[PDB]
Ligand binder design. Structure first.
Ligand SMILES: *[C@@H]1O[C@H](CO)[C@@H](O[C@@H]2O[C@H](CO)[C@@H](O)[C@H](O)[C@H]2NC(C)=O)[C@H](O)[C@H]1NC(C)=O
Ligand code: NAG
Ligand code: NAG
Lengths: 50, 49
């Protein structure tokens, strides 16, 4: 007829805790912006997705 | 004028190992949305079983 399966009880979460804050203000509300032909590329890493 | 009692061997297969599979678990797993989507597709894996 069917198959016998079990059900989960609680959820377990484990994530890498890089809680060093992400300065998105200097990239979003920046005083100076680059042009289309020469766009500035910054490799943002090791921060939070706030 | 003479005879030889020779012995020959013949090998013939009979059957194999019986295999039974299920669609809702092997195709996707424990997802409820997959089962809901498969319920509207008919009874293909029922016919396979
Ligand atoms: C028919 O062939 C068999 C062998 O295939 C012969 O048996 C041999 O006989 C000699 C002498 O009697 C023995 O030294 C051998 O050891 C025997 N062979 C085996 C395998 O045992 C038999 O003699 C033959 N028959 C005739 C009438 O010649
Ligand atoms: C990450 O580190 C912080 C403090 O350093 C801690 O409170 C948190 O539990 C850690 N996250 C883990 C272990 O998953
Ligand atoms: C610029 O961005 C910052 C980011 O925190 C925000 O606080 C501020 O209101 C924005 N505008 C001005 C005019 O500074």
């Amino acid at each position: 007829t069917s198959n016998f399966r079990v059900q989960p009880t609680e959820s377990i979460v484990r994530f890498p805790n890089i809680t060093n804050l992400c300065p998105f203000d200097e990239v979003f509300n920046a005083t100076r912006f680059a042009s289309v032909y020469a766009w500035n590329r910054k490799r943002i890493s090791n921060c939070v997705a706030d | 004028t003479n005879f030889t009692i020779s012995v020959t061997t013949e090998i013939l297969p009979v059957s194999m190992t019986k295999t039974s599979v299920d669609c809702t678990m092997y195709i996707c797993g424990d997802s409820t949305e997959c089962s809901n989507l498969l319920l509207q597709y008919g009874s293909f894996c029922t016919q396979l079983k």
